Amino acid sequence: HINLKVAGQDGSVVQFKIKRHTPLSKLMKAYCERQGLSMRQIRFRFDGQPINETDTPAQLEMEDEDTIDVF
Amino acid sequence: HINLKVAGQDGSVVQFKIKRHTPLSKLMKAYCERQGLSMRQIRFRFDGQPINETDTPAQLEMEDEDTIDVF
């Protein structure tokens, strides 16, 4: 796995573990579930790019300890 | 203290601090409390071994930044 941080605009940083070729939708759904949030209300970006349902960390060239931003 | 990660099957990683000779039941109860989960519904393992109420990190030979798995 690689470790990723999910950072909210409030400064919250939540941690996930994901394999490099696993879709990030696994993480996004988990984050929504754990944070009591809805995919209706939030969106995720990496390095300014929206993350789509089938994007994987490897396709987005993410590395251990990288941060995904939530808006 | 040593720092331990508690990893869910959804990829969530939550962090705890615990002293080496303190029972891990301290951590398990805290995790359930913070995650809104019940000891009825989940169980914790380290390196494939179930964690019992009085097991300590030292008895289970845990080290800083080790991961406990939740199922």
Added chain:
Amino acid sequence: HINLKVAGQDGSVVQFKIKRHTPLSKLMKAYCERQGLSMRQIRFRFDGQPINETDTPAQLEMEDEDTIDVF
């Protein structure tokens, strides 16, 4: 940003990111929000000192990976 840990007496460690000259009240309010807790019920300390509304990490001489204690 610098990364700060917020540690509860139950051993929970939650992570925040904050800029050095931004008031820590940003973090305290976020922690309360994310943890479902109230500023009525809890207080935050760093190195034994209460944290006030306008105190910044730089004024309190905090560094990356320092811990704020909640009581």
Added chain:
Amino acid sequence: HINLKVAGQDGSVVQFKIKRHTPLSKLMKAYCERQGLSMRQIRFRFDGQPINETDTPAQLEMEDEDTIDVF
């Protein structure tokens, strides 16, 4: 004080002065009062984030001549 602009979707830009640790609710109420508008009908955002009653310009990392958006 810092100077802030409040921009409507019609392109109107109205100016306020506020101290960095004063809640922005001071400004929001003033804007509603001066513009003949109601907090029922409008909401304020900064950099895509909703502004809450006790948020201060310092907590939201606002600077002189920044713009708050009204919707």
